[PDB]
Amino acid sequence: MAPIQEYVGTLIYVGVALFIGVAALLVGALLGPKKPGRAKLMPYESGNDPAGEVKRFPVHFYVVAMLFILFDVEVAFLWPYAVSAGGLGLYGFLGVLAFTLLLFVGFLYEWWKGVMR
Amino acid sequence: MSYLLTSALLFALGVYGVLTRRTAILVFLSIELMLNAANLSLVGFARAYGLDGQVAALMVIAVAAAEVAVGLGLIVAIFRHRESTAVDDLSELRG
Amino acid sequence: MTLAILAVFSVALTLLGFVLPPQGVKRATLLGLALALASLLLTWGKPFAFGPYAVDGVSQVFTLLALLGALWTVGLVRSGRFEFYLLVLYAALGMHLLASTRHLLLMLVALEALSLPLYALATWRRGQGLEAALKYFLLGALAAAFFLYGAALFYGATGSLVLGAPGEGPLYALALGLLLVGLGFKAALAPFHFWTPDVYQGSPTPVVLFMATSVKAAAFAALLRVAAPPEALALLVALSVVVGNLAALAQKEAKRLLAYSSIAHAGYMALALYTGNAQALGFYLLTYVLATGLAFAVLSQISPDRVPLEALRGLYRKDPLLGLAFLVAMLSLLGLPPLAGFWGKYLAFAEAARAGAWGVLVLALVTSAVSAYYYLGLGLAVFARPEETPFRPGPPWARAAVVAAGVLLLALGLLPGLVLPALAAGG
Amino acid sequence: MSLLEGLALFLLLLSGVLVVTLRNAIHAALALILNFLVLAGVYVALDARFLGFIQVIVYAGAIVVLFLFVIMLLFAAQGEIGFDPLVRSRPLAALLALGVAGILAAGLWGLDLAFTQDLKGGLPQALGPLLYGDWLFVLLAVGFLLMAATVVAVALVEPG
Amino acid sequence: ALFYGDRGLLSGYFGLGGAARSLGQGLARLQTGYLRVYALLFVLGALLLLGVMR
Quickly list DSSP for C305-368: S--BGGGGTTHHHH-HHHHHHHHHHHHHHH--TTSHHHHHHHHHHHHHHHH--HHHHHHHHHHH
In angstroms, the CA D107 to CA A66 distance is 38
CATH number at residue E42: 1.20.5.2700
Beta bridge partners of residue C308, listed in sequence order:
C253
Cα torsion through C10, C13, C14, C17, rounded to 10: -150
Name every residue whose Cβ is closer than 8 Å to that of residue C32 and which is 6 or more positions away in sequence.
C5, C6, C9, C13, C89
Cα torsion through C197, C198, C201, C203, rounded to 10: -130
Backbone phi, psi, residue B23, to 5°: -125, 140
Query: Which residues 121-160 in chain C show a CB within 8 A of chain B?
Result: 127-128, 130-135, 137-138, 141-142, 144-145, 148-149, 152-153, 155-156, 159
In angstroms, the CA C133 to CA C137 distance is 6
Domain that holds residue E11: 1-54
How many CB pairs lie under 8 A apart between chains A and B? 26
DSSP state of D63: I
Q: 3-class secondary structure for D85-125?
A: HHHHHHHHHHHHHHHHHHHHHHHHCCCCCCCCCCCCCCCHH
- Give the other-Cβ count within 10 Å of E32's Cβ: 15
Q: 3-class secondary structure for C94-128?
A: HHHHHHCCCCHHHHHHHHHHHHHHHHHHCCCCCCH
Domain count across chain E? 1
Which is nearest to C72 in space by CA: C246, C205, C187, C164?
A: C205
Backbone phi, psi, residue C422, to 5°: -115, 65
Quickly list DSSP for B37-93: HHHHHHHHHHHHHTSHHHHHHHHHHHHHHHHHHHHHHHHHHHSBTB---BS------
**Beta carbons of E40 and D99 less than 8 Å apart:** no
In angstroms, the CA B8 to CA C175 distance is 13
Which is nearest to C109 in space by CA: A73, D150, D138, D131?
A: D138
Backbone phi, psi, residue C42, to 5°: -70, -10
DSSP state of C249: G
Alpha-carbon radius of gyration of chain C: 20
Biggest CA–CA distance in chain E, Å, is: 58
In angstroms, the CA C289 to CA C284 distance is 9
CATH number at residue B49: 1.10.287.3510
Q: Is the dihedral angle over the CA atoms C116, C121, C126, C132 positive or is it negative? A: negative
Which of E32, E47, E48 to probe the D interface (max D CBs under 10 A)?
Answer: E47
Which is nearest to C105 in space by CA: C139, C143, C154?
A: C154
| Residue C229 touches chain E, beta carbons under 8 Å | yes
Backbone phi, psi, residue C253, to 5°: -140, 135
Beta bridge partners of residue B86, listed in sequence order:
B23
**Beta carbons of D44 and A73 less than 8 Å apart:** no
List Cα–Cα distances, A4 to C128, D45, D65, in angstroms. Answer: 55, 8, 30
Class of domain A1-116: mainly alpha
Cα torsion through A20, A22, A23, A25, rounded to 10: 120
Name every residue whose Cβ is closer than 8 Å to that of residue D112 and which is 6 or more positions away in sequence.
none
CA atoms within 13 A on the CB side of A46: 4
**How determined?**
cryo-EM
In angstroms, the CA A110 to CA D146 distance is 13
CB C82 within 8 A of CB C25: yes
**Beta carbons of D137 and C119 less than 8 Å apart:** no
Q: How far is A53 from chain D (nearest CA, A)?
A: 13
In angstroms, the CA C336 to CA C351 distance is 19
List Cα–Cα distances, A82 to D50, D129, D139, in angstroms. Answer: 13, 12, 15
Name every residue whose Cβ is closer than 8 Å to that of residue A21 and which is 6 or more positions away in sequence.
none
Summarize chain D as % helix, strand, coil (round to 5).
75, 0, 25
Domain count across chain B? 1
- Give the other-Cβ count within 10 Å of C141's Cβ: 24
| Residue E50 touches chain D, beta carbons under 8 Å | yes
Name every residue whose Cβ is closer than 8 Å to that of residue C247 and which is 6 or more positions away in sequence.
C260, C263, E24, E27, E28
In angstroms, the CA E44 to CA D68 distance is 31
Backbone phi, psi, residue C361, to 5°: -60, -40
CB C226 within 8 A of CB C179: yes
Name every residue whose Cβ is closer than 8 Å to that of residue C174 and which is 6 or more positions away in sequence.
C153, D103, D104, D106, D107, E50, E53, E54
Task: Report the residue of chain B nearest D80, measured CA to CA.
Answer: B22
Which is nearest to C273 in space by CA: C241, C226, C239, C235?
A: C226
Which is nearest to D84 in space by CA: B37, B82, C300, E35?
A: E35
Domain count across chain D? 1
DSSP reduced 3-state for B23: strand
List Cα–Cα distances, C112 to A19, C67, C95, in angstroms. Answer: 45, 18, 10
CB D100 within 8 A of CB E40: no
Quickly list DSSP for E4-35: HHHHHHHHHHHHHHHHHHHHHHHHHTT----H
For helices C372-379 and C358-370, what crossing angle results, to 10°?
30
CATH number at residue D132: 1.20.120.1200
Name every residue whose Cβ is closer than 8 Å to that of residue D131 and which is 6 or more positions away in sequence.
A77, A80, A81, B55, B58, D139
Name every residue whose Cβ is closer than 8 Å to that of residue D83 and which is 6 or more positions away in sequence.
none
Which is nearest to D35 in space by CA: D13, D57, D52, D50?
A: D13
CB C284 within 8 A of CB C344: yes
In angstroms, the CA C377 to CA C312 distance is 10
Which of B35, B54, B80 to probe the A interface (max A CBs under 10 A)?
Answer: B80
DSSP reduced 3-state for C253: strand
Q: Where are the domains of chain A?
A: 1-116
DSSP reduced 3-state for C49: strand
Name every residue whose Cβ is closer than 8 Å to that of residue B5 and which is 6 or more positions away in sequence.
D105, D108, D109
Alpha-carbon radius of gyration of chain B: 17
**Beta carbons of C14 and A112 less than 8 Å apart:** no
DSSP reduced 3-state for C23: helix
DSSP reduced 3-state for C54: strand
For helices C340-355 and C396-414, what crossing angle results, to 10°?
50
**Beta carbons of E39 and B18 less than 8 Å apart:** yes
Q: Which helix (H) or strand (E) holds E46?
A: helix E35-52
- Give the other-Cβ count within 10 Å of C374's Cβ: 23
Which is nearest to D128 in space by CA: A102, C52, A79, A74?
A: A79
Exposed/middle/buried for residue C222 (C-beta within 10 Å: 0-12, 13-18, 19+): buried
CB A21 within 8 A of CB D142: no
Summarize chain C as % helix, strand, coil (round to 5).
75, 0, 25
List Cα–Cα distances, C53 to B26, C4, C105, C218, in angstroms. Answer: 37, 11, 12, 15
Domain that holds residue D114: 1-160
In angstroms, the CA C259 to CA C255 distance is 6
Beta bridge partners of residue B23, listed in sequence order:
B86
Q: How far is D109 from chain A (nearest CA, A)?
A: 30
Backbone phi, psi, residue C319, to 5°: -145, 130
Which of C249, C263, C367 to probe the E interface (max E CBs under 10 A)?
Answer: C249
Residue type at position B24: A
Going through chain A in order, the beta strands assigned E by DSSP cover none
Residue type at position C39: S
Residue type at position C159: G
CB C10 within 8 A of CB D143: no
Angle, alpha carbons D62-D6-B56 (nearest 5°): 40
Domain that holds residue B57: 1-95
DSSP reduced 3-state for B16: helix
Biggest CA–CA distance in chain D, Å, is: 57
In angstroms, the CA A115 to CA A98 distance is 25
In angstroms, the CA A114 to CA A63 distance is 9
In angstroms, the CA B28 to CA D68 distance is 12
In angstroms, the CA E52 to CA E44 distance is 12
Which is nearest to C181 in space by CA: C113, C118, C108?
A: C108
Chain D environment of B51 (Cβ under 8 Å): 119, 122, 126, 130
* Through-space distance between the first and last CA atoms of chain E, rounded to whole angstroms: 58
CB C246 within 8 A of CB C370: yes
List Cα–Cα distances, D55 to A66, B11, B70, D52, in angstroms. Answer: 18, 18, 20, 5
Beta bridge partners of residue C253, listed in sequence order:
C308
Q: 3-class secondary structure for C204-243?
A: CHHHHHHHHHHHHHHHHHHHHCCCCCHHHHHHHHHHHHHH
Which is nearest to C101 in space by CA: C232, C225, C260?
A: C225
Quickly list DSSP for C128-150: HHHHHHHHHHHHHHHHHHHHHHH
Exposed/middle/buried for residue A55 (C-beta within 10 Å: 0-12, 13-18, 19+): exposed
In angstroms, the CA C248 to CA C252 distance is 9
In angstroms, the CA C39 to CA C78 distance is 27
